[PDB]
Structure formats: C-alpha cells, structure tokens
Structure 1
Amino acid sequence: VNPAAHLTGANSSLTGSGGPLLWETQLGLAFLRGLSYHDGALVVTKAGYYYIYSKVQLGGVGCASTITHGLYKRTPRYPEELELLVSQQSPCGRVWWDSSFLGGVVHLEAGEEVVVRVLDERLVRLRDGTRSYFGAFMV
C-alpha cells in the first residue's frame, strides 16, 4: 500500500490565526491512505520520498499585493518550520482570479509533517473543494 492523500478546501480552511490552512480529510474527494492529518498538517507514518502538491485559488477586487503560497515541513527536532516549495505571485496586476500550483519531491521521516500557508490568506477563495487543495504521494 503506497501512501497517498488529497485534502480539499473546506468551511474551516481559513483560520486567520496566521497558522497553516486546514482541510477536509474524509468527505467528497478528500482522502487519506497511509498518511495521517493533525491541525492542517499531513502527518507522515512511513518514511521516504513524497511528491507533495498544493493548489490555492486566489481572487479579489483591485489591489502586500504579493502573495506567498508555500509548503513547509515541521519536525519535532527543530522549533521552526522549514520551507520546501514556495511561490510568490502578484496577481492583482475590478475582479481578478489566479491559481497558484506547487509540487515537488521531498524526503520525509515518520513523525514529520507538511503544512500549507498562504500570506495573505484573505485572498483564498473557497468554492467547492476543487480549487484549493493539498496532497501527496510516495514515489
């Protein structure tokens, strides 16, 4: 059984605390298969290399008109997040819409976690669980 997951945009995804996004893990298209979840984070139970990915749907009305969309690692060995894969976009360059997609292979040990952060989070526009999401699979 190869570890895989795909977590979707949900009612509670945008905390406004400055912590990571949260995600649906069971309903609709969301699932967990050999990976776990805790407070927004994919929790790794089997060590190896994983392609991690995230999409966030951004949108707004006119124009910190630079958005950072990132995936970050947490390990209990070190008290600060480590950035893994990060995008900067200034999409407000009236109504606008933009999608930011990231993926890549990272090495993860058991007990490590991956989270998604968008700054400013207020520009994420949730609709149906198809336009913002976070997932991974072992490769």
Structure 2
Amino acid sequence: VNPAAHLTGANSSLTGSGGPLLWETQLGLAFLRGLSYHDGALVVTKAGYYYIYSKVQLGGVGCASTITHGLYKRTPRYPEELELLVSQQSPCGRVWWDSSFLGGVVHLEAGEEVVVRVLDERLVDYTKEDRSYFGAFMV
C-alpha cells in the first residue's frame, strides 16, 4: 500500500502562534493512507521519497507586503526546522486574491515530519476545504 495523504484547511487552521498551520485529516476530502498526523505535521512511517505539496489561497484588502509559503521538515536529530520548498509572493499588488502552490520530491525517514507555514498566516483563506491543503504520496 503506497502512502498518501491529502489534508484540508479547517476552522482551527490558523493558530496565530507563528507555528505551523493545522489541518483536517478525516472529514470531506481529507484522508490519510499509510501516513500519520500530529499537531499540524504529517508524520512519516515508511521511509522513502515523497512528492509533497501544498496550496494556500491567499486574499485580503489593501496591504509584510511579502508572503512566504513553505513546507519544512522536522527531525528529532536537529533542533530546528529544515526548509524544503518555499515561495515568496507579493500579491498585495481594495480586494485581491492569489493562490500559491508548492510541490517537490523529498526524502523522509520514518519518524520525520513535514509542516506548512505561511507568514503572514492571516492572509490564508481556511474557510474552504478545496482552497488550502497539504498532502503527499510516496514515489
């Protein structure tokens, strides 16, 4: 069975703490198959190369004119997050909408984790499960 997951924006997604986004893992389009989840992280149980992705729908009113959207690894072997795939966008150039998508193949051991962070978080629309999400699959 090939690990896969797709996690969706949820009412709890934006903590305001500067930490990772949280996600839904079972309702509507969300699911886990051969991966786990823990406090915002996808937790890997089978080691290998994974294609990881995330899309965030961004939006706001006028204008931290720069948004960073990224996927980061956590390993117990080092006490700081490691960057995997990051984008910077300045879409504030009244109402605007932009969506940021990231995907890429990374190596992950059992027990390592992946998270998503956006700065600033508040520009993320979490109100719709089809518009912000985070997933992966083994390749």
- TM-score bracket, normalised by the shorter chain, equals over 0.9
- How far apart are the structure 2 equivalents of 1:126 and 1:36? 21
User: 1:1-139, aligned counterparts within 5 Å?
Assistant: 1-139=1-139
- How far apart are the structure 2 equivalents of 1:138 and 1:115? 16
- How far apart are the structure 2 equivalents of 1:97 and 1:5? 26
State the shift of 1:63 in Å: 1.1
Please give the secondary structure, in 2, of the residue aligned with 1:77: coil
- How far apart are the structure 2 equivalents of 1:30 and 1:122? 22
State the shift of 1:127 in Å: 2.3
- How far apart are the structure 2 equivalents of 1:61 and 1:29? 29
TM-score w.r.t. length of structure 1: 0.99
- How far apart are the structure 2 equivalents of 1:124 and 1:107? 28
Q: CA RMSD in A?
A: 0.4
State the shift of 1:114 in Å: 0.2
State the shift of 1:136 in Å: 0.1
- How far apart are the structure 1 equivalents of 2:61 and 2:28? 30
Q: Is the 8 A contact 2:11 2:127 kept in 1?
A: no
Fraction of identical pairs, as percent: 96
Tell me the alpha carbon deviations over residues 83-118 of structure 1, each in whole angstroms, 9 at most, x when there is no partner: 000000000011000000000000000000000000
Please give the secondary structure, in 1, of the residue aligned with 2:80: coil
Structure 1 residue runs of 5 or longer lacking an equivalent are none
- How far apart are the structure 1 equivalents of 2:62 and 2:77? 42
TM-score w.r.t. length of structure 2: 0.99
- How far apart are the structure 2 equivalents of 1:96 and 1:110? 40
State the shift of 1:125 in Å: 1.2
Q: Is the 8 A contact 2:35 2:42 kept in 1?
A: yes
